[PDB]
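Hi R.,

Here's the input for the flavin mononucleotide complex you asked about:
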Amino acid sequence: KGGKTLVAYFSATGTTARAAKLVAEAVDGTFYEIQPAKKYTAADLDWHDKASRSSVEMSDSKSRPALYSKLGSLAEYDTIYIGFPIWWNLAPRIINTFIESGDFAGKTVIPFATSGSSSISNAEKELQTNYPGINWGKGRLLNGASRETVKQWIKK
Ligand SMILES: Cc1cc2nc3c(=O)[nH]c(=O)nc-3n(C[C@H](O)[C@H](O)[C@H](O)COP(=O)(O)O)c2cc1C
Ligand SMILES: [Cl-]
Ligand SMILES: [Cl-]
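And here is the predicted structure with flavin mononucleotide in place:
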């Protein structure tokens, strides 16, 4: 009952959630939301305020926002897509909490993201460098995500 695909994603304002729905449909994967214990408020997401929760977390590479629930088994999956918004050219720190809360061995892991304009390159490189034991697959920025842009990425 293995060899399945998981599409895991974090989304604060729904943009990455909609791109992840399109990815899950395109790969016939299980749609899974990475849930913070404390949801990000408008004040938390204030990029201009150096004291906002997101500003503090993104200034600290060791920050690990807690998850809402413990992670279930990932044994049934051989492929895991991980989606997120780009925050300050990086994956939000909850993505580090997620990766550090399960066993990703023997799995292909593919990052995808949405952004205001930044590329996924730095965010992806930092994930590869911090988790060199994972079989990273080439990631993709999915801005203005549609059934057609996602179909093209998956069909190659
Ligand atoms: C704290 C914070 C930092 C951000 N930093 C970046 C950035 O470095 N580059 C970028 O192009 N967009 C940046 N954005 C914009 C988001 O990546 C973009 O709006 C994303 O699509 C939001 O996705 P979501 O609705 O799934 O949460 C930032 C947004 C927030 C809240
Ligand atoms: Cl709010
Ligand atoms: Cl690793």
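One thing worth noting: The radius of gyration is 15 Å.

Cheers,
M.
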